[PDB]
């Protein structure tokens with residue numbers, strides 16, 4: 001309820017440039033580039049995401065609401081918007097993270113990642129998600145690919161709210177989302193569980209070898225992702241709770257922060273990793 005004095009920067013096309021493509025995703029294409037604020041004598045390296053065309057009817061109405069949220073973010077574990085340009089296309093400008101997404105990071109560094117880092121990442125993601133819940137925003141696409149590494153000890157969530165805006169990731173979705181297209185903070189919790197599984201397996205693909213078309217059927221039969229080799233039952237049990245059919249029986253993000261935080265105080269008790277003494 002304090003005044004929100006975030007800045008919404010509406011950028012002229014001349015105030016930034018795209019220099020090199022970094023990759024593409026469900027929502028658009030990401031480039032490294034420069035932000036060159038008019039009359040300020042500086043140039044700042046940034047990431048720029050050019051959004052794909054919306055399949056949604058009202059998205060042009062909603063783009064600004066989405067910008068407001070991204071601009072407004074004030075949590076260490078959620079990424080923020082630097083500026084937005086709306087012309088022929090919508091382009092989002094934000095800080096450039098040299099260390100990239102968490103999914104690639106765990107795959108690339110698997111031999112070197114220990115229990116403290118893994119648990120801390122769980123806490124941090126939970127913290128960011130809790131913040132988004134406080135703001136009444138449902139992410140709809142939480143996944144390891146949508147977490148960026150600021151430093152190996154500091155990760156931040158991206159891309160919240162774009163799925164709705166733009167109008168699927170079946171393997172990360174709660175059953176109610178798949179069957180009924182219902183999305184809630186509790187559906188986010190299910191995705192959080194899948195995301196944790198991705199981390200704990202050093203970036204394995206969930207349900208690898210099962211076609212997306214079969215996922216709703218297997219879930220209904222009680223199948224769930226398996227216990228990762230490094231995980232004690234204490235960690236895995238939390239992940240399984242995230243995947244309860246009854247959304248209200250799943251943990252709250254605030255509870256998740258607490259549970260992971262406790263385990264992060266003695267990480268070797270809760271994850272068993274070679275060379276992690």
Ligand SMILES: */C=C/C(=O)N1CCC[C@@H](n2nc(-c3ccc(OCc4nccn4C)c(Cl)c3)c3c(N)ncnc32)C1
Pocket residue numbers: 022023024025030047048049070078079080081082092093094095096097098100101102103104144145146148157158159160
């Ligand atoms: C595993 C992730 C992956 O493969 N990629 C492809 C290469 C580029 C990577 N990447 N993406 C961004 C980025 C994410 C989200 C962005 O805007 C949406 C948003 N979420 C919160 C706030 N905002 C504005 C933007 Cl503009 C870029 C990257 C960034 N920002 N830095 C480094 N790599 C990024 C993902």
Ligand SMILES: [Cl-]
Pocket residue numbers: 075076077
């Ligand atoms: Cl920060």
Ligand SMILES: [Cl-]
Pocket residue numbers: 078079080094095156
């Ligand atoms: Cl950020």
